[PDB]
Amino acid sequence: ALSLTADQMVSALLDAEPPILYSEYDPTRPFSEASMMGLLTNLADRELVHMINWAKRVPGFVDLTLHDQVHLLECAWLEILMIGLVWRSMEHPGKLLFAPNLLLDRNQGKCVEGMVEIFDMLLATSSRFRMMNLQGEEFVCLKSIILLNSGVYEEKDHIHRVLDKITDTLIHLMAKAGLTLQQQHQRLAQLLLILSHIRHMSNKGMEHLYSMPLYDLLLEMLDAH
Amino acid sequence: LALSLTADQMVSALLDAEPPILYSEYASMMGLLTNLADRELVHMINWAKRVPGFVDLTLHDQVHLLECAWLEILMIGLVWRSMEHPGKLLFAPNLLLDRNQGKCVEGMVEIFDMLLATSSRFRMMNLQGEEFVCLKSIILLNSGVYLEEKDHIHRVLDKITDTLIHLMAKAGLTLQQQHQRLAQLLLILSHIRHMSNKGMEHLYSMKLYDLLLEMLDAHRLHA
Numbered sequence: 539a540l541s542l543t544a545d546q547m548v549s550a551l552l553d554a555e556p557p558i559l560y561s562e563y564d565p566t567r568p569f570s571e572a573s574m575m576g577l578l579t580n581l582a583d584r585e586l587v588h589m590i591n592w593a594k595r596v597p598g599f600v601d602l603t604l605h606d607q608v609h610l611l612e613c614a615w616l617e618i619l620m621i622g623l624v625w626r627s628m629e630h631p632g633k634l635l636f637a638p639n640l641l642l643d644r645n646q647g648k649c650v651e652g653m654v655e656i657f658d659m660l661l662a663t664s665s666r667f668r669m670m671n672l673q674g675e676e677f678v679c680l681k682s683i684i685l686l687n688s689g690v691y692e693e694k695d696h697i698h699r700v701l702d703k704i705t706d707t708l709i710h711l712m713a714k715a716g717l718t719l720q721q722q723h724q725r726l727a728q729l730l731l732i733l734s735h736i737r738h739m740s741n742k743g744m745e746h747l748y749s750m751p752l753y754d755l756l757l758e759m760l761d762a763h
Numbered sequence: 764l765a766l767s768l769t770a771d772q773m774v775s776a777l778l779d780a781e782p783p784i785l786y787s788e789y790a791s792m793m794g795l796l797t798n799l800a801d802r803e804l805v806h807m808i809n810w811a812k813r814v815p816g817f818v819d820l821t822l823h824d825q826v827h828l829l830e831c832a833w834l835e836i837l838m839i840g841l842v843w844r845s846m847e848h849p850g851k852l853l854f855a856p857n858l859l860l861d862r863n864q865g866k867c868v869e870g871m872v873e874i875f876d877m878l879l880a881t882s883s884r885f886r887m888m889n890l891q892g893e894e895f896v897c898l899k900s901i902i903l904l905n906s907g908v909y910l911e912e913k914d915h916i917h918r919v920l921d922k923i924t925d926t927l928i929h930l931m932a933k934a935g936l937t938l939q940q941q942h943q944r945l946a947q948l949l950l951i952l953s954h955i956r957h958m959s960n961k962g963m964e965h966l967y968s969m970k971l972y973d974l975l976l977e978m979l980d981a982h983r984l985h986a
């Protein structure tokens with residue numbers, strides 16, 4: 539785990555990338571609040587399966603005990619679906635690419651009980667990713683970080699060194715791209731601060747989701763794996 | 764102006780803006796914390812106005828920044844002042860609570876535990892006051908940041924990163940240790956946001972835009 543070079547880390551992660559799934563094939567439009575919720579729910583659930591496989595490929599992840607793994611996923615799943623959303627939405631200004639066959643815009647997002655707020659936040663995040671020209675290899679570094687860090691609250695120590703290893707890898711990608719040492723640290727901070735907002739959106743979303751078992755589910759899923 | 768400060772000028776500006784540590788004036792426990800929070804707010808606005816870049820913002824923007832960061836600000840200060848009081852939260856010098864005392868409020872334990880773990884992690888990394896003050900300003904500037912305006916703030920933020928690294932180098936960490944520590948501290952900003960988000964839920968379960976607007980307004984007519 540802590541034996542991978544910057545480059546080995548990066549390729550490992552890129553390989554672990556989950557596939558991009560599709561929305562239940564053309565149901566009916568315009569959707570309703572429940573119909574859209576249903577497409578979104580079906581999608582998320584199917585994506586949750588791949589997430590488990592990806593998690594299991596995240597350096598450090600499978601060194602933890604099954605129950606700690608469940609804890610990290612329990613807490614990060616929504617952040618992780620969201621960073622994937624934002625990233626695949628980058629080249630669709632004004633719209634979110636929940637799936638290739640389900641590209642919604644601000645107005646569609648209002649069909650559901652106050653997701654406008656989040657949708658907008660989400661919109662702004664890919665926008666900033668676009669603005670910063672976020673790169674694939676950095677994106678995968680940010681996801682792994684979200685996975686290890688949202689739930690981190692000799693094992694504690696282990697995760698902190700994997701986390702330090704991903705920072706190393708993020709700065710290594712920046713240097714190799716020619717950034718100045720000053721630009722390196724600035725970009726590193728611009729990225730980690732975006733995790734603050736990502737977290738923010740998942741807490742808002744979790745609230746919106748519950749206004750409208752996971753442990754056991756993930757345990758079952760993680761153990762089955 | 765803000766963008767022209769050196770790393771060391773930034774730090775002292777900041778150290779200078781520190782609010783005073785207030786005391787508990789003593790829904791009893793909830794009373795105590797509401798009174799404390801309320802009086803702290805008043806100084807927060809004041810310190811806000813001394814964060815480089817902050818006053819270059821429109822009044823609306825200033826209120827949006829505090830509207831979203833106030834609780835993260837209160838918490839990071841609680842955390843910091845709790846550091847050397849393992850097992851307890853030092854809400855005030857005359858109001859040091861423990862895990863169990865936090866239990867007397869429904870839902871407070873989980874946040875309380877979270878608050879405890881954050882000060883623990885601050886202890887663990889030997890967070891320095893200079894670094895602390897740096898992290899508070901980033902919180903103010905970042906939690907509500909979501910067009911030469913957007914850009915200003917982002918530059919102020921870059922300068923804070925610069926200052927953060929400066930203190931680290933100055934302290935003698937290696938280049939590698941610098942980005943590592945920088946990253947360790949900024950991931951703690953997600954947990955802080957997390958506690959704030961959870962804390963507002965809890966606050967509103969129990970039972971401000973203009974409040975700050977007036978406050979930010981009144982500050983220009985204050986002696």
Ligand SMILES: O=C(c1ccc(OCCN2CCCCC2)cc1)c1c(-c2ccc(O)cc2)sc2cc(O)ccc12
Pocket residue numbers: 578579581582583585586619620622623636652653654656657742743746747752755
């Ligand atoms: O709409 C969803 C969403 C819907 C249902 C979900 O979960 C339903 C239940 N499921 C139970 C087993 C554990 C996995 C979750 C999760 C996300 C998505 C998001 C969301 C956005 C705004 C908002 O206000 C609330 C949520 S973002 C997102 C990205 C995706 O790839 C998929 C769904 C989503």
Ligand SMILES: O=C(c1ccc(OCCN2CCCCC2)cc1)c1c(-c2ccc(O)cc2)sc2cc(O)ccc12
Pocket residue numbers: 796797798799800801803804837838840841854870871872874875961962965966971974
């Ligand atoms: O208890 C408080 C607190 C209590 C009442 C508050 O609100 C007072 C209402 N007021 C209205 C106008 C805006 C300013 C707040 C805010 C914080 C504090 C915290 C808290 C912790 C756990 C939790 O679940 C909820 C809150 S943390 C904290 C730090 C302080 O310096 C002061 C109070 C606090």
